[PDB]
């Protein structure tokens, strides 16, 4: 439940969660079980957020919150992303299946978070494509997932087929992420590597072309200090009034 | 005209892109029109899923060369119509981005530039067919129309390729410290020398760096003579005597090492928000030393900025921190800070129950200092002055928030990397400055 200001007890719990104090977290949640799902918009800091937004998730700590009935239906970072959406954004199959086993809700737009890093050539790898296939597999199938919308009318399949790569000069290279997904969806580990190297070669060619022609006409003012490459932002679905007006 | 129909198709194909790209693409298109950037125009046309024909390049003025009247009368009318059909906030953002992304001066000729004389003329012309209420409302807000050469932000803890540890020796020190320098250049090199040679505790170097930051040069130099009086440091006795004599042969303005330090410090402070998504680290399991500071800052800054800006106040990158803080301050440099302090009172009223209030306010103010000193000189101490003003100090005190930024920079170890990396680059800078 929403708690704008974290109480002293909730900070104490979240402190123990971040510090990896397994016994303290367990003992806190034993006496005060209502603390497990208290989040603070717009940051959405919460016991769950302290374990989910780490490079390497401490699933031993995550199991503790699961034992005290943590839920996965509320945003867990200031991007207002649900736990499943964060798993799709990172294409983290380990976290994604862990959540689906623990009955985490999969929003309709959750597949569209698989594509936020589809603008980065460095993410067009075998494991990332395989992980996405293992993720789309658990969400049904390529055809079942390709139909889901993103709160802007755009469908996953149309988005994956109309993907693009951005270089550090702002130039784009259009490619087909669905075809990359379709080329391996459970020999094929060579069809993809040829498709990837075709795109890897086309990206490197366009990046050299834009270095000579685009120069920093885009990058200097519109990309400095931003994400490089700029992520494919999923359209905003969860809206919240400002505190100055509430 | 059919060329106007083609122009509408181009403009409206921008609007068929995801909504998060309309502002970017329209600003880039307006820049490409005003600067005759043919590659940029072709890139935009291909990016909105269109095909660029040579007729499009001719009509869009790509092959033009008139940097004083870039938009032809026909193209100017086209742009006037398209901007008239635009919302006020959107039109303000588009014009601001288009003008602030265009340089006035450029050594490399054939890079599209527009003088300030021309920008001042283009702005009212572009909104000529715009609603006159929206027009003058834009003429009032669009006061900074000049080029914004956005300085990069740095985060060495994640392997930032920009960082270069200074190479100051005991030998290079003594040769340069032969006091042709001034007090600032002397203190920078000394702290840079004590840092590489480990002539002090980590908190000691941070205490020296905080005395230099707050222009306590007399306090800083005194603690340096006290450190040299130690017996385990005189060898690493004859060269230490040379360090003392320099303290009485100094010059005394041309404070470029001071300006470089303050600017570089702001870039490291503003760079806290950098991650591997904002800096390509093509090499490589350990957490960065500033990770908790970065987590606490992005939490504090999101709570504060989204309190005023709503969902549009979300901050994830150094640039967004820079952008949303400047926007929030518009709801001189000391004037912008005083407005921030006034608005923080509303935040500290709603969040007076928050146990993180003092830490959130202080973390946010550090970022504000980083935002303003990164966009202009002299701004750092200007922000520091009003924040330490007794009337502002009393506003914070009435909410239970202490703002003593000297003790914060001197004592708190999470701010040590900011001073160390700034004093590192200031040593390299001052090394080559006096080496000429």
Domain at A5, CATH number:
1.25.40.20
Contact by Cβ (8 Å): B101, B108: no
Instruction: Judge if A197 and A149 occupy the same domain.
Output: yes
- B14-17 long-range contacts, CB within 8 A, separation 24+: B14/B44, B14/B48, B16/B48, B16/B49, B17/B47, B17/B48
Instruction: Determine contact: B263 vs chain A, CB below 8 A.
Output: no
Residues B104, B356: Cα–Cα separation, whole Å: 44
The 10 Å Cβ neighbour count of residue B107 is 6
Bridge partner residues of A175 (DSSP): A163
Residues B22, B15: Cα–Cα separation, whole Å: 6
Instruction: Judge if A62 and A166 occupy the same domain.
Output: no
Q: Note if the bond before A42 is cis, omega within 30 degrees.
A: yes
User: Taking CA B251 as the corner, what is the angle to CA B248 and CA B257, rounded to the nearest 5 degrees?
Assistant: 115
The structure tokens listed for A29 are 């949640």
Contact by Cβ (8 Å): A212, A95: no
Q: Which of A44, A65, A80 is the last residue of a domain?
A: A80
Contact by Cβ (8 Å): B185, B433: yes
DSSP chain A: -B-SS--HHHHHHHHHHHTT-HHHHHHHHHH-GGGTT-BBTTTTB-HHHHHHSSSS--HHHHHHHHHTT--SSS--STT---HHHHHHHTT-HHHHHHHHHTT----TTGGGGGGTTTT-GGG-SHHHHHHHHHHHHHTS-HHHHTT-B-SSS-BHHHHHHSEEEE-TTS-EEEE-HHHHHHTT---HHHHHHHHHHHHHHHHHHHHHHHHHHTTTTTHHHHTTTS-SSPP-PPPP------GGG-
Phi/psi of residue B382, nearest 5 degrees = -65, -45
The 10 Å Cβ neighbour count of residue B112 is 20
Q: A-contacting residues of B 316-345, CB under 8 Å? A: 316-320, 322
Within a domain: residue A123? yes
Resolution (A): 2.4
Give the mutation candidate from B25, B30, B33, B39 for the A interface (greatest A CB count, under 10 A): B39
Instruction: Determine contact: B27 vs chain A, CB below 8 A.
Output: yes
Beta-carbon-side half-sphere exposure of residue A9 (alpha carbons within 13 Å): 13
Instruction: Judge if A112 and A206 occupy the same domain.
Output: yes
Contact by Cβ (8 Å): B185, B299: no
Residues B208, B423: Cα–Cα separation, whole Å: 10
Q: Identify the CA nearest to A51 among candidates A116, A95, A85, A8.
A: A95
User: Taking CA B317 as the corner, what is the angle to CA B312 and CA B322, rounded to the nearest 5 degrees?
Assistant: 70
Instruction: Determine contact: B149 vs chain A, CB below 8 A.
Output: yes
Within a domain: residue A98? no
Q: Which of A32, A60, A80 is the last residue of a domain?
A: A80
The 10 Å Cβ neighbour count of residue B152 is 17
Domain span at residue A59?
1-80
Q: Identify the CA nearest to A43 among candidates B316, B272, B288.
A: B316
Alpha-carbon gap: A199 to the closest alpha carbon of chain B (Å): 17
> Are residues A221 and B101, on separate chains, in Cβ contact within 8 Å?
yes
Method: X-ray
> Are residues A236 and B308, on separate chains, in Cβ contact within 8 Å?
no
Give the mutation candidate from A46, A75, A171, A225 for the B interface (greatest B CB count, under 10 A): A225
Instruction: Determine contact: A220 vs chain B, CB below 8 A.
Output: yes
Instruction: Judge if A74 and A120 occupy the same domain.
Output: no
Produce one character per residue of A152-189: b if its CB has 16 or more CB atoms within 10 Å, e if not: eebbbbebbbebbbbbbbbbbbebebbebbbbbbeeee
Q: Note if the bond before A229 is cis, omega within 30 degrees.
A: yes
> Counting every residue, how long is chain A?
246
Instruction: Judge if A131 and A176 occupy the same domain.
Output: yes
| Residue carrying the six token digits 């106040």 | B313
Phi-psi region of B198 (alpha: psi -120 to 50; beta: other; left: phi over 0): left
Within a domain: residue A31? yes
Bridge partner residues of A165 (DSSP): A173
| Residue carrying the six token digits 């291909």 | B46
Instruction: Judge if A123 and A17 occupy the same domain.
Output: no
Residues 6+ apart with CB under 8 A from B28: A218, A222, B40, B44, B101
Q: What's the sign of the alpha-carbon dihedral B63, B67, B68, B74?
A: positive
Instruction: Judge if A126 and A224 occupy the same domain.
Output: yes
Instruction: Judge if A112 and A212 occupy the same domain.
Output: yes
Residues 6+ apart with CB under 8 A from B399: B345, B348, B349, B352, B357
Contact by Cβ (8 Å): A9, A41: no
Question: B39 contacts in A (CB within 8 Å)?
Answer: 210, 213-214, 217
Q: Identify the CA nearest to B60 among candidates B91, B31, B103, B87.
A: B31
Residues 6+ apart with CB under 8 A from B286: none
Closest CA in chain B for residue A46: B299
User: Taking CA A59 as the corner, what is the angle to CA A53 and CA A61, rounded to the nearest 5 degrees?
Assistant: 85
Q: Which of A80, A100, A124 is the last residue of a domain?
A: A80
Q: Identify the CA nearest to B295 among candidates B318, B324, B272, B276.
A: B272
Number of domains chain A contains = 2
Three-class DSSP labels, chain B: CHHHHHHHHHHHHHHCCCHHHHHHHHHHHHHHHHHCCHHHHHHHHHHCCCCCCHHHHHHCCCCCCCCCCCCCHHHHHHHHHHHHCCCHHHHHHHHHHHHHCCCCCCCCCCCCCCCHHHHHHHHHHHCCCCCHHHHHHHHHHCCCCCCCCCCCCCCHHHCCCCCCCCCCCHHHHHHHHCCCCCHHHHHHHHHHHHHHCCCCCHHHHHHHHHHHHCCCHHHHHHHHHHHHCCCCCCCCCCHHHHHHHHCCCCCCCCCHHHHHHHHHHHHHHHHHHCCCCCCCCCCCCCCCCCHHHHHHHHHHHHHHHHHHHHHHHCCCCHHHHHHHHHHHCCCCHHHHHHHHHHHHHHHHHHCCCCCCHHHHHHHHHHHHHHHHHHHCCCHHHHHHHHHCCHHHHHHHHCCCCCCCHHHHHHHCHHHHHHHHHHHHHHHHHHHHHHCC
* Closest residue to B150, CB basis, from A152, A220, A236: A220
| Residue carrying the six token digits 């709503």 | B310
């Amino acid at each position: 439940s929403e708690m704008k200001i974290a109480s002293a007890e909730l900070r104490e719990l979240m402190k123990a969660v971040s510090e990896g104090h397994y016994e303290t977290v367990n003992t806190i949640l034993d006496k005060d079980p209502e603390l497990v799902n208290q989040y603070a918009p717009p940051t959405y800091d919460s016991p769950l957020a302290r374990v989910l937004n780490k490079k390497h998730i401490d699933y031993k700590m995550l199991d503790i919150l699961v034992k005290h009935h943590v839920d996965f239906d509320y945003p867990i970072n200031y991007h207002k992303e649900t736990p499943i959406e964060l798993a799709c954004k990172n294409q983290d199959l380990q976290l994604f299946k862990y959540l689906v086993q623990h009955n985490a809700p999969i929003s309709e737009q959750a597949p569209h978070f698989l594509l936020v890093n589809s603008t980065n050539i460095k993410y067009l790898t075998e494991d990332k494509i395989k992980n996405t296939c293992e993720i789309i597999k658990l969400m049904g199938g390529l055809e079942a997932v390709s139909s889901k919308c993103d709160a802007e009318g755009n469908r996953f399949g149309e988005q994956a087929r109309k993907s693009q790569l951005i270089n550090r000069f702002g130039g784009i290279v259009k490619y087909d992420y669905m075809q990359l997904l379709q080329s391996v969806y459970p020999g094929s580990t060579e069809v993809l590597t040829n498709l990837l190297n075709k795109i890897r070669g086309q990206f490197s060619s366009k990046e050299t072309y834009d270095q000579q022609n685009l120069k920093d006409s885009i990058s200097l003012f519109f990309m400095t200090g931003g994400e490089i490459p700029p992520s494919r932002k999923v359209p905003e679905s969860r809206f919240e009034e400002a505190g100055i007006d509430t | 005209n059919i060329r106007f129909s083609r122009f509408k198709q181009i403009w409206q194909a921008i609007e068929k892109t995801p909504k998060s790209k309309h502002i970017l693409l329209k600003s880039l298109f307006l820049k490409g029109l005003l600067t005759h950037n043919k590659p940029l125009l072709e890139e935009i046309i291909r990016q909105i899923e269109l095909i660029p024909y040579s007729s499009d390049l001719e009509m869009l003025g790509a092959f033009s060369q008139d940097k004083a009247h870039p938009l032809s009368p026909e193209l100017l009318e086209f742009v006037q119509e398209m901007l008239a059909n635009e919302s006020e906030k959107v039109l303000l953002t588009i014009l601001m981005n288009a003008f602030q992304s265009i340089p006035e001066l450029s050594l490399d000729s054939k890079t599209g530039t527009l003088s300030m004389k021309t920008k001042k003329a283009l702005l009212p012309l572009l909104i000529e067919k715009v609603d006159t209420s929206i027009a003058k409302s834009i003429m009032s807000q669009l006061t900074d129309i000049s080029f914004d050469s956005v300085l990069p932000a740095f985060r060495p803890s994640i392997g930032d390729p920009s960082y270069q540890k200074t190479n100051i020796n005991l030998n290079k020190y003594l040769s340069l410290v032969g006091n042709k320098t001034d007090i600032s250049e002397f203190l920078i090199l000394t702290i840079g020398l004590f840092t590489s040679l480990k002539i002090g505790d980590k908190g000691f170097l941070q205490e020296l760096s905080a005395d230099y930051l707050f222009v306590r040069y007399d306090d800083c130099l005194h603690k340096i003579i006290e450190k040299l009086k130690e017996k385990e440091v005189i060898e690493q006795e004859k060269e230490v005597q040379k360090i003392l004599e320099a303290s009485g042969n100094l010059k005394r303005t041309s404070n470029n090492p001071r300006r470089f330090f303050e600017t570089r410090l702001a870039q490291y402070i503003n760079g806290l928000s950098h991650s591997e998504k904002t800096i390509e680290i093509d090499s490589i399991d350990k957490e960065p030393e500033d990770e908790e500071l970065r987590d606490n800052t992005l939490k504090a800054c999101n709570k504060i900025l989204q309190f005023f800006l709503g969902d549009c106040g979300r901050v994830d990158t150094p640039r967004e921190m820079e952008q949303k803080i400047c926007i929030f301050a518009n709801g001189s440099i000391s004037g912008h800070t005083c407005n921030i302090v006034g608005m923080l009172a509303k935040y500290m009223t709603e969040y007076k129950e928050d146990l993180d209030l003092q830490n959130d306010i202080n973390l946010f103010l550090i970022q504000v200092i980083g935002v303003y000193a990164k966009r202009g000189f002299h701004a750092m101490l200007e922000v520091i002055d009003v924040l330490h003003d007794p009337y502002v100090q009393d506003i914070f005190k009435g909410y239970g928030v202490q703002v003593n930024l000297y003790s914060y920079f001197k004592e708190n170890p999470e701010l040590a990397g900011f001073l160390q990396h700034a004093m590192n680059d200031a040593t390299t800078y001052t090394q080559a400055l006096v080496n000429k």
